[PDB]
C-alpha cells in the first residue's frame, strides 16, 4: 500500500526463522535496534508485526526512532522506544513502468503530528487559512495526498524502495514465535553429555 495506509500483518503462529532469511542477497538496509541481527534466531518474541509500504530511497533514513522529516511526521512515526528491525531493498524492477507509476500516494499536509504508531486515512480537505473550507477545494483548501513520480530511469534518490518493519513485541506470553532448534545425531555406547528436549 501507499505509505499513508501502511499495512499491518500480524505474523505469528510459526517458527521464527530470522537468521535463516538473513542472507537473502537482496537487502540494501537491515538495521535491528536492541537485538543482534545475526543472533535474532536465539532472541525470539511474542508477536511480530510486519508493516509494509513503499517509499523513495531518499526517505529511508527518516525511518528510525526519534527521527524527523516528512515521512516520520505525517505518514508513519516509529516509536521512540522501538525494539525491532527495519528491512528495505530496492524494488525498481517492479513498481515503476514507462509512463510513470501514480498508484502510490503519501500524505503531505496535517494539522497535528502523528503519535507513534497511528494510522490516519482521512480524505478531508486541509485548511491552512482561517475560514471554513465547507467541502470546497481551492485557495487555502488543499488536497493532502501527493502522488509519487516513479520512473525506472531516475537516479536512486527518487527510485522506489520497498520497506518492511518488523516490530518485535513481548508480553507475559509463552512466546511461540521462535527460531529453529538445531539437533545432533544419536551416539550410543559412549559416556556422552546429552541434552534431550528439555
Amino acid at each position, epitope marked *: 500500500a501507499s505509505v499513508y495506509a501502511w499495512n499491518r500483518k500480524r505474523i505469528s503462529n510459526c517458527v521464527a526463522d530470522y537468521s535463516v532469511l538473513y542472507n537473502s542477497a537482496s537487502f540494501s538496509t537491515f538495521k535491528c535496534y536492541g537485538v543482534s541481527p545475526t543472533k535474532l534466531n536465539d532472541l525470539c518474541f511474542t508477536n511480530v508485526y510486519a508493516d509494509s509500504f513503499v517509499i523513495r530511497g531518499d526517505e529511508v533514513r527518516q525511518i528510525a526512532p526519534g527521527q524527523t522529516g516528512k515521512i516520520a511526521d505525517y505518514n508513519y512515526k516509529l516509536p521512540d522506544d522501538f525494539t525491532g528491525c527495519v528491512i528495505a531493498w530496492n524494488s525498481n524492477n517492479l513498481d515503476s513502468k514507462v509512463g510513470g507509476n501514480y498508484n502510490y500516494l503519501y500524505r*503531505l499536509f496535517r494539522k497535528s503530528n502523528l503519535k507513534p504508531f497511528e494510522r490516519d486515512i482521512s480524505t478531508e480537505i486541509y485548511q*491552512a487559512g*482561517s475560514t471554513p473550507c465547507n467541502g470546497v477545494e481551492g485557495f487555502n483548501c*488543499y*488536497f493532502p495526498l*501527493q502522488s509519487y513520480g516513479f520512473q525506472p530511469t531516475n537516479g536512486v534518490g527518487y527510485q522506489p524502495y520497498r520497506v518492511v518493519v518488523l516490530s518485535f513485541e513481548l508480553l507475559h506470553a509463552p512466546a511461540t514465535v521462535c527460531g529453529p532448534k538445531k539437533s545432533t545425531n544419536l551416539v550410543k555406547n559412549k559416556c556422552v553429555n546429552f541434552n534431550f528436549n528439555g
Partner: antibody
Amino acid sequence: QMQLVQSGPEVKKPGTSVKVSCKASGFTFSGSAVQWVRQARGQRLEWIGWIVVGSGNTNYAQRFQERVTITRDMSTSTAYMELSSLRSEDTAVYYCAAPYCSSTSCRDGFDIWGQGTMVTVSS
Amino acid sequence: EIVLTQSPGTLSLSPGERATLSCRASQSVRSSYLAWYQQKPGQAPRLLIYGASSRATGIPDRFSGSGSGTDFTLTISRLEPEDFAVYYCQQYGRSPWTFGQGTKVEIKR
C-alpha cells in the same frame, strides 16, 4: 523579516525566452503559495497564475495558458517563472506575491510583495 | 470568467472627508475573497484589506471594508494627505483571479 528578494532587470529580444526568480526569507516558505502578476507602465494590472509551494500544483491564465511554466525550488526556497516565445509587446514589470504563512496557520491575503523586476524588450 | 468593474473612475476629496470606492462582480464569489491594495507611483502595491472586512497589519484604523455577497465597497473615513493614489480589487473565486480597472483619487486646491 517577511520579505521577498527578486531578480534584476534585463533586456531581452523578440523570440527569446526569460526566467525570473524571487527568493523567500523571513517566514515558513514551505506552506505558502506564490502568484505572479505583471503590469505595463501605468495600466490595469494583469494576473498570470499561481502555484502551491508544497504540492507543486499550478494554474495559468487563459491568455498565457500555453506559453508559461512556473517552477519552484523547495531546497533553496525560490520560485521561478518562465516565459516562452516572448515578444516585444510584453515589456512590463513583474511582481511575485505570497502570504505570510508560518507553520501554524496563515493569512487569506497576499501580504508580501516583491520590489518587481522590469523586463525591457526592443530591437 | 469574473468581471470586476470599478467606478467612479476618479474622485476629488480634499484631505479628510469620507469616501467610497466601488467594484462589482457578475458571478458568484465568497465574500472573504476580495482584497484591496493601493499603489504609490513607482512602488509595488501594498495589502490594505483582506476578507473585504478585516484590516491587515499596520493599516490605519480609519478604513473598513464593506463586502456584500457580490457588492463591494471600501469606506474611506478621511483622506490623510498621503492616501491620494490608485486602488485595486482582486477576487479569489475558483475561476481565474482578475483585477479591477483601478481607481485614482486626485488632490484639488
